[PDB]
Amino acid sequence: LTPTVCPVPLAHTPTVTKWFKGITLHLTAMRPTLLTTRKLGLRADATAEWIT
Amino acid sequence: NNSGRPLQETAPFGCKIEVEPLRASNCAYGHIPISIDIPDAAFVRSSES
Amino acid sequence: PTILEVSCTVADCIYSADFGGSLTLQYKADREGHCPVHSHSTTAVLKEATTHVTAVGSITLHFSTSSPQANFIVSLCGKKSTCNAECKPPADHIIGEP
């Protein structure tokens, strides 16, 4: 077993609408794609979800 | 014989009547509330003007 | 190069993270050189660090604030000057800059 580079696909880049203290992500996917966020404050409150 | 006058000399607000799509083009009523998205390339910063 | 007859004034102010405000400024120095420009508040950071003075010239500056109004003093080359303002809320309420 040995290390080797390999290609992985880039997803479709999102579309953001900007409401007051808030983001909406108009996403798309055909296959399960991980999304993950976190704050930059003391409370990191991370999120993970495999949207389809 | 008793048809009366057409719409081209009775229509209010100065409308000219085109017949082939049956339009009432080029007349004036109300206000048109629009909004223009100015591109960010026609803006020089205030240190240069 | 010492300094005389300074009077700052504002033209427009937003309060944001980008440099929104822009103030003009008059100065009557006796000689020419490089004099430091600074605001002595803690809510107005000033972009231009230095400038080049002349006899009867004028300087346009840039700053950024978070206070809903600006009452702070700027400083050219040693002596202070005061000028009031009135800052407005911005429209783009998500931006990519801290």
UniProtKB/TrEMBL annotation, chain A:
It is found in: Host cell membrane; Host cytoplasm; Host nucleus; Virion membrane. The precursor of protein E3/E2 and E1 form a heterodimer shortly after synthesis. This is Structural polyprotein. It comes from Western equine encephalitis virus. The lineage of its organism: Viruses, Riboviria, Orthornavirae, Kitrinoviricota, Alsuviricetes.
TrEMBL record, chain C:
It is found in: Host cell membrane; Host cytoplasm; Host nucleus; Virion membrane. Disulfide bonds join C8-C83, C13-C87, C35-C77. The precursor of protein E3/E2 and E1 form a heterodimer shortly after synthesis. This is Structural polyprotein. It comes from Western equine encephalitis virus (WEEV). The chain holds residues 1091 to 1188 of 1236 of the full protein.
